[PDB]
Paper text:
Lysins (amidases, lysozymes/muramidases and peptidases) are such specialised bio-molecules. The term lysozyme, or muramidase, is broadly used to describe the enzymes that cleave the β-1,4-glycosidic bond between N-acetylglucosamine (NAG) and N-acetylmuramic acid (NAM) (or vice versa) in the carbohydrate backbone of peptidoglycan, Figure 1. In addition, we have determined the crystal structure of the apo enzyme and of complexes with reaction products (chito-oligosaccharides). The structure presented here is the first to be determined for the avian upper-gut subset of GH22 lysozymes, and is, as expected, very similar overall to other C-type lysozymes.
As expected, OhLys has a typical GH22 lysozyme fold. The chain was traced from Glu1 through to Cys126, with a glycerol from the cryoprotectant, four Cl− ions and 200 water molecules. There are four disulphide bridges (Cys6–Cys126, Cys30–Cys114, Cys63–Cys79 and Cys75–Cys93) in the structure. This increase in negative charge of OhLys is evident in the surface electrostatics of the enzyme. So, charge interactions between the enzyme and the substrate at working pH are probably functionally important.
Numbering used by the authors: 1 to 126
The structure:
């Protein structure tokens, strides 16, 4: 399903995302827009790894999909748990990734389309 922008804003605010590892709500909204386009079932199969769900979490380092060579399962979850309408597993796993990296550099979509920009538009009007 698609999680509307302002719904996602409220979900992340009510989960303590503002200030989390120095990040902002706008950072995460812009991240989602450029990674999954707000789709809980977003999916990219790059070949050596697959990315799952609203935060495009990676089967090489963070979730087990049973079909990625050279993998570790840093979030100790099946990737299929990141393809559901329930964002709890996504939130827990994304927080662990961002805590590991002390920020959002794991997400190229955020580096390329968000970092160092005016992100007002992502968080206004809710
Ligand atoms: Cl909730
Ligand atoms: Cl807040
Ligand atoms: Cl960051
Ligand atoms: Cl708001």
């Amino acid at each position: 399903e698609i999680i509307p922008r302002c719904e996602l804003v409220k979900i992340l605010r009510e989960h303590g995302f503002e200030g989390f590892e120095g990040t902002t709500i706008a950072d995460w909204i812009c991240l989602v827009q450029h990674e999954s386009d707000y789709n809980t079932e977003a999916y990219n199969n790059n070949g050596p790894s697959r990315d799952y769900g609203i935060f495009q979490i990676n089967s090489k380092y963070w979730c087990n999909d049973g079909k990625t060579s050279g993998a570790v399962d840093g979030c100790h979850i099946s990737c299929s748990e990141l393809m559901t309408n329930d964002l709890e597993d996504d939130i827990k796993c994304a927080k662990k990734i961002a805590r590991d990296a002390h920020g959002l550099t794991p997400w190229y979509g955020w580096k390329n389309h968000c970092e160092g920009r005016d992100l007002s538009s992502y968080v206004k009007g809710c």
